[PDB]
Amino acid sequence: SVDEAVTTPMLNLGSYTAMFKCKVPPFSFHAFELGKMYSVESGDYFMTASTTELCNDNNLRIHVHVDDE
Amino acid sequence: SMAGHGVRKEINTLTTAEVDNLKDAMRAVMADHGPNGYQAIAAFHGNPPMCPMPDGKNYSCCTHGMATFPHWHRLYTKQMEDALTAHGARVGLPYWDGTTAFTALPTFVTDEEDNPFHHGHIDYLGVDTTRSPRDKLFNDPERGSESFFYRQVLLALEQTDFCQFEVQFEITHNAIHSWTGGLTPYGMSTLEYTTYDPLFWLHHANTDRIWAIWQALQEYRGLPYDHANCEIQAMKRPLRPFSDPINHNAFTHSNAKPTDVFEYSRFNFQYDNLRFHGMTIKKLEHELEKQKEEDRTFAAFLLHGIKKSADVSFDVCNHDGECHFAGTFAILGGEHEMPWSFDRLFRYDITQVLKQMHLEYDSDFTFHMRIIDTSGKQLPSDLIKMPTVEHSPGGKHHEKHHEDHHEDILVRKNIHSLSHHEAEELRDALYKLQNDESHGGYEHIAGFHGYPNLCPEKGDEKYPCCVHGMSIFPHWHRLHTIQFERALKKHGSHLGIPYWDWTQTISSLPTFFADSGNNNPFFKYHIRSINQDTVRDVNEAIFQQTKFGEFSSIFYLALQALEEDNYCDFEVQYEILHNEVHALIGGAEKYSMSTLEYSAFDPYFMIHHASLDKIWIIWQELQKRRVKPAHAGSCAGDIMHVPLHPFNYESVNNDDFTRENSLPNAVVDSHRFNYKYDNLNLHGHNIEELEEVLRSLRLKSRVFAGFVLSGIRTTAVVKVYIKSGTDSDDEYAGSFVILGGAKEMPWAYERLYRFDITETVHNLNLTDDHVKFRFDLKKYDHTELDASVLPAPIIVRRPNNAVFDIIEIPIGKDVNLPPKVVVKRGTKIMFMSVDEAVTTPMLNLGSYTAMFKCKVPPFSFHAFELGKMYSVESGDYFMTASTTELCNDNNLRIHVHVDDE
Amino acid sequence: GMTIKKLEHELEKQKEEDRTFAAFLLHGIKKSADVSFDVCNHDGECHFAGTFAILGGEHEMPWSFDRLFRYDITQVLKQMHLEYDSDFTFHMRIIDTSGKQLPSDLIKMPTVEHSPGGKHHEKHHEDHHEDILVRKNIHSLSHHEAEELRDALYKLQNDESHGGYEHIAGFHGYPNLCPEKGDEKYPCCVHGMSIFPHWHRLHTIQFERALKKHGSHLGIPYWDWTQTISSLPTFFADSGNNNPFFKYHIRSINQDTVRDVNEAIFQQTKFGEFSSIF
């Protein structure tokens, strides 16, 4: 949550790589990633900025991916 | 990768790659210690014994000598199959068609070295499996087809009744175990050991196949395939250990009950073909009936558990003492087997033997029976009761048959075939619904799709539940349509929602709507929530140039949908085709059918989606004929594994089917929803007939204009205009519509939108790869909007004969689009050298997404993409600008991706 | 009484209907006994399924039936209102002649079987004929039902006679009639009086009776306005198609019946403490 200026939203698994380009939906908080939280499930994930503009402020695109050993 | 089911095909048609995967997968399966291991699965069959009885006694789990027998084994085969798949097999156990004569055991099993199929180790025994085939195994044909396996199975097939069928079927099943295993202690001949041999699966796969063929025949007969009137009680009880929560496999666990077991499709595996021997199902039925014509004499046996496996042979003897070999049957068993006794007799066709004896039914002759154990020791005759002799005549008069149907089966009959009497139920049902404000009400049902937006759980954000543009787009709709229909039936409906085949030449709008007077409920509906009635601004949407191929207007698009292979590529064609109708009906109007947020309310809307749904069905199975089944998870499945909102959210129609079976994988099959269409035909063409028309398009090379459409957040139209060499004269290349609106959830077509420009381009005479680009103009329901986001058309040429290649020509410079996935492994790719200023380099697969950001190496031409070129290989690709700076000139990032159907 | 030909016909008729049977496997139980069994639903409610007897004794030769003995359960299930698919239990008691009970071990559990055949149900049935009239709910209204109301009202509205709509409405509002040639006029409408509902109740029937004479199937539809009001009834709202329910032309003075609807909505809570009308 570093930098209070940006809150906790951080979209989540926006979709696929194309979406990852920073497409985020109009305020539709497709919840998944919140404040201090955690997540057990596997598969392919992703994290994008809370808002479309908020994305461009630092390019919050990190595409987390979670596979097997 | 095939999207659909793990298919099981014949063993004799072994494809090297397939065999390799199976061997490897099996090897891994054998190795794993886990509960979904080879040893663990094998254990289910018998030793070590997995079943508890309430006394604590342990017995072999397999159900034999019972009606449940095919059900239990069906699950067992699947259990092993799932394991192999996890291991990486292309899904499916191969089936060994034992029925047909074969010189030797399948090579697949036979190969001694590096073959996991050859044998398996038995941990408890501490020895490997063994097999000693009996020579009797290759049955001697009189006819050539006339073999014992064939005959035994054939008799089973003839039986109408499930129970009658099962006994014959099961006994036949046993024959393979005996002959293969023979005397050896470790093999198939023993109940305990059999699961260990890998051949076991091949055999059971075949046995399951036999059952499947029978079901198909029953369906053909019109007799119930899924359920059995007999042994009602047995079906209900679960088959352990599958029912146990210990069971790692969810699917088998879910279909623990024999009632559940019947539907194989739920199992998610299919067979390459039902055809028994060469015969088709239709043919087989005919063949069977012929047998009926002649009288036959049978010997009947009552069999019970004789604590062991044994082979019985009996001969028919005349008083003279002359005898001939009557026949053989086998019993599979062992110690710790569960007790079983057949409810009915096992029938064996004596007729040939009697004729040879020249005996008559009435004549007094004797049956001699000898029971031999596997060891060769003779058993006492006390084990089996003396056989009965019966005569079966041939012919019939006034045979009233009893085949049940219509538990909850509705049918959506054509609006045209509609009758005055039929029409009333529709009007009444709809009206009663419309007046209904409850959660079940019409006002509420329409609400799911358009405004007001519900689905997020008290988000207070709102959210259009309407899923458009997603891969799921038809899935959500198909369920919604049924939701509308189901609501009506509860309201008092006789028939299903009428569907309209708008593809055919449209003389005028349906009378169903047009009759605005008499307060027709189908014509419009009062929102009541906000107010305002459902109005529509009809468009011409007519003028007929030509039918039966090259049909101008809607049909081509729809026909174009069926044309497309793969689901993912299909869905786009599916939606866009659907998108068109909404526009003509809704027109410009605020509250119209064209307005996504509102269109749900319109009466036509509820029915209209049904008409589209019909197209999906024809296509769904149509693909199956193609040996490319694609329904369920195919390419972009991830979206599917999540329930359709708001159907799952607690506040739906509360329809038990809907609320529960909201899952997309479930919705894929319409037959579950309890409704059927009066016909499969489109534009007056039957499935086989229509398939021909499709062939016509493949006949001629056509150039297509690729489109990467992304959520505009509004519904609108686009006019594609092709530039001309002369001045710049545009041309009406055509037009398509993009549905959407205000705060809709974001969407973007992963797949390209095939749009046919061909004739238009030829006039101007330009080349697909060569400098060819066009500027379209798009427009909102009424007014102009930013044409800007094209995004730049990605020309694709679809070669004529020898298709399913598809060529994809992206572009070079001033290109605009995210990662486009042509998919359809085997597709071809290229690039447009448009703008001489930029040469041919275009990096290639730079690396991963991070690299895609435009990292390109210093002049290191990591070759891959050149000038006019192509590429067959699959996997994930990419294309970036030749140089780092050259990237920024137009953002040449297109991340091509190429997966499987 | 039946002849052979007749009997065969009688038997076939039985075949026509589906039946459910319980099957018993019987073997020598070294004695004579009477067996009675009941069908019970899960509830534990039971009904007497049926009875059969076994004749036997010591030194009887051993015997076992090759097939099951069938007993027709169908009537019992219907009484239970059980379905074949439904899960129910069969309870069996074996009593010897002496009255001593035998162990159930002697007989194996019964099997159940289904016999044909089914059909599709057409909605052939007819409910009540117009005996007495009934004022059915406006909501429960059907399209077909709706027409009779519109037709009946319309025919009345066009009717100027004393029986006419213009006249019936006249009783309550203007013009005022009731005093016998008082030339005073007088609103017949009785409001505020103790009789207030009495006069109205009769007037309402007067309206309804006028319609039936005019050609009505059903009674005047009533609207339960207390319940949360989503919107005005469709019956009125459909101003188009010249809906007779929406408005009426006075014709006497002129001017159509217009209404200035008020919000009359917003729902706070139902089922007690209902705000507004209820």
Ligand code: CUO
């Ligand atoms: O059935 Cu248990 O063995 Cu093939």
Ligand code: CUO
């Ligand atoms: O799909 Cu939601 O509209 Cu036809």
Ligand code: CUO
């Ligand atoms: O008006 Cu006279 O009563 Cu309601």
